[PDB]
């Protein structure tokens, strides 16, 4: 029993983390085969980050301007190029610890593990959801750019996120590993703001199933609702509309617990309208939306 925010084991990613330094600017890189991937603003000085033209900035650089360090070992940069907001530094040594991997872009509402690093050294691991407004609520200080987010399936690391920056609201923004931003953001130190966020309805329902599997049942009731009537309530509380596809995805959890999805939607409607009246669910006094249905099944069934 029990339910925790649980990250994937990070060992396969730790072996890929390096430090990349240009001038006095430093951050993390991802070393796979003979390429190091890193955020392109490593080529900025502080003076450059208000209004950089990255094409110009990179033309003014050469291979020797990039100091790449894997632990104590300096890697020689033999080529450099830009791909969107990511730099690709070709090095003379292929990473012997390169796992089987993929570069995948994730959907809003999905989760991933972040390996936070500084100076090329992993410092900790934690779970994040891609918010509907394409930000993530992470834990990132200066020096963390280039930390990556990933999921693991069998032996394969699917890299989905590279960290770049923090918005004034304290939330975080970054790219996929092809350097394309999640959300309407740009890598420059300008006033920027994310769109209004919403709550991930299908994940809240998944977590309520988690709670039932773990013996929290006080929020259950005999009522049921229609998808349209529920979505009327969901729209009033800034929840994402629920779709038949979401209902389908909750099918396995529904079958396991014996609680029909639209029955559990009736419970959620009640919680949204009345609150919890001093009670908790899985130790929380708030409705949790950063667990996907897959996260619930993975953890309540013991996938390795």
């Amino acid at each position: 029993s029990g339910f925790r925010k649980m990250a994937f084991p990070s060992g396969k990613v730790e072996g890929c983390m390096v430090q990349v330094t240009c001038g006095t600017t430093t951050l993390n890189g991802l070393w796979l085969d003979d390429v190091v991937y890193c955020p392109r603003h490593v080529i900025c000085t502080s003076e450059d980050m208000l209004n950089p033209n990255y094409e110009d900035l990179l033309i003014r650089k050469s291979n020797h301007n990039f100091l790449v360090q894997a632990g104590n070992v300096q890697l020689r940069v033999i080529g450099h190029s830009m791909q969107n907001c990511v730099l690709k530094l070709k090095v003379d040594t292929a990473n012997p610890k390169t796992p089987k991997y993929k570069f995948v872009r994730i959907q809003p509402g999905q989760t991933f593990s972040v390996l936070a690093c500084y100076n090329g050294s992993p410092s900790g691991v934690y779970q994040c959801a891609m918010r509907p407004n394409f930000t993530i609520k992470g834990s990132f200080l200066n020096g963390s750019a280039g930390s990556v987010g990933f999921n693991i399936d069998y032996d394969c690391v699917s890299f989905c996120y590279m960290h770049h920056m923090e918005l004034p609201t304290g939330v975080h923004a970054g790219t996929d590993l092809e350097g394309n931003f999640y959300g309407p953001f740009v890598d420059r130190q300008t006033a920027q703001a994310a769109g209004t966020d919403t709550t991930i309805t299908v994940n809240v329902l998944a977590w309520l199933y988690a709670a039932v599997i773990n013996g929290d049942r006080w929020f259950l009731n005999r009522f049921t609702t229609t998808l349209n009537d529920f979505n009327l309530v969901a729209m009033k509380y800034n929840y994402e509309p629920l779709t038949q596809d979401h209902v389908d995805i909750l099918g396995p959890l529904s079958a396991q617990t014996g609680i029909a999805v639209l029955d559990m939607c009736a419970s959620l409607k009640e919680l949204l309208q009345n609150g919890m009246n001093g009670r908790t669910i899985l130790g929380s006094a708030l409705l949790e939306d950063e667990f996907t249905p897959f996260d619930v099944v993975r953890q309540c069934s013991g996938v390795t």
Binding site: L27, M49, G143
Partner: peptide
């Protein structure tokens, strides 16, 4: 207030 790029200082 502005975005902060989260590179570090050497």
């Amino acid at each position: 207030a502005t975005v902060r790029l989260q590179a570090g200082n050497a």
